[PDB]
Amino acid sequence: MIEIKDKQLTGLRFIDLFAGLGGFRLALESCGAECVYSNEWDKYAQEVYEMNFGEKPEGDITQVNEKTIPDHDILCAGFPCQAFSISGKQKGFEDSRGTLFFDIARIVREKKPKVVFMENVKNFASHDNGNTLEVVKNTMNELDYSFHAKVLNALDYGIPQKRERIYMICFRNDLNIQNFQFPKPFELNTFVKDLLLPDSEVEHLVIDRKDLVMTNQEIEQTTPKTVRLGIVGKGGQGERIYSTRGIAITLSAYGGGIFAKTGGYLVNGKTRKLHPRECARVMGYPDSYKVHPSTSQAYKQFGNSVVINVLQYIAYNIGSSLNFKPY
DNA sequence: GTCAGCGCATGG
DNA sequence: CCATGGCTGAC
Ligand SMILES: Nc1ncnc2c1ncn2[C@@H]1O[C@H](CSCC[C@H](N)C(=O)O)[C@@H](O)[C@H]1O
């Protein structure tokens, strides 16, 4: 993560829905806001959260009466993406994992917060011939909010990962906010090779396979794109090998392949997958964040999360717009 | 609960 | 043509 000296959000409160690791929390707290409620039902997510923040998130959102919730100013929520991802069955709202959005709607109507800030995958904006996005747009307008959405590739903001996501911000109609804007991009100056650990700590992650085919030569100069050097088996998800001089591919939570959830990389002549910590780093997490003791669960948790750095820049821009109230 | 081989939509 | 991003069955 980046460091914010001008704390544009001091004195405001928010809630953490579908918390996971608490990615939304680090982002907002670094700016000066305060967390007053949280909610996440996965047994293990509940453990890491407690370990790093010191409180236990409430359970199942579908059975929590909306009137218990504390008063707040910003509702943070990165709802489930398996029903909308380009790697799935694309069942949208017909999937019981796809109807969460409406519980958000339910909560919003009662507490009328100043800002709603959500996140989801690139394909959300194109699913069902574009109908799905309209539905979120119209429901938000009807509840008296404005709607702002855009797709941002992580490599345009300092993190070497090809992760494209749609971000959605909604201000309450009576505040009259007319100058919010999405941060401007910049040149990358960090690559996969600048975050790896020493060879003595990753020795157990190596893999020697004899169905290894080489389709390209290792490059000699840095670039901001994924460079495939080889393949194993048939070359499907988790069977592709890239270079440490380019950038990482999207980390996932239920992935397959011999190089599951992270991908394979050629390091100093040997091929291997990434360490939980090297995963924490390509997601922009700080070396002080204690990860879960069970390696397996740790991989899944990272593949489900958000990048910290992008959430930060957008967070700042939000506060700036709320703070401009001239005579 | 963990592992690994898959199979096809979408965007050039 | 060419490359990327969860589901399902096995123990
Ligand atoms: N019905 C429900 N009630 C509560 N939490 C739920 C839920 N359905 C799914 N979840 C949890 O929703 C999360 C969505 S992914 C979000 C990750 C989070 N943004 C990050 O910063 O790490 C998963 O952890 C899932 O276990």
d(CA A226, CA A186): 18
CATH number assigned to the domain comprising residue A15: 3.40.50.150
Do A163 and A46 share a structural domain? Answer: yes
Is the CB of residue A246 inside 7 Å of nucleic acid strand C? Answer: no
Terminal C-alpha separation, chain A: 36
Is the CB of residue A253 inside 7 Å of nucleic acid strand B? Answer: no
d(CA A75, CA A240): 39
Q: How many domains does chain A have?
A: 2
Angle at A102 between CA A101 and CA A104, to 5 degrees: 70
d(CA A104, CA A170): 13
Question: Which DSSP category does A248 fall into?
Answer: B
Active site residue A81: yes
Do A151 and A108 share a structural domain? Answer: yes
Q: Which nucleotide is nearest to A80 (CA to C1')?
A: C6
Question: Which DSSP category does A231 fall into?
Answer: E
Closest CA to A102 of A72, A143, A69, A131: A143
Do A195 and A322 share a structural domain? Answer: no
Contact assessment for residue A192 and residue A160, using Cβ atoms and an 8 Å cutoff: yes
Closest CA to A153 of A245, A226, A97, A241: A226
d(CA A242, CA A236): 13
Contact assessment for residue A153 and residue A123, using Cβ atoms and an 8 Å cutoff: no
Do A233 and A96 share a structural domain? Answer: no
Chain C positions with a protein C-beta closer than 7 Å = 3-8
Do A291 and A279 share a structural domain? Answer: no
Gap from A219 CA to C3 C1', Å: 19
Do A300 and A192 share a structural domain? Answer: no
Q: Which two tokens stand for residue A127?
A: 């699913």
Residues 152-171 of A with CB under 7 A from strand B: none
Structural domain that includes position A182: 1-186+285-327
Do A297 and A279 share a structural domain? Answer: no
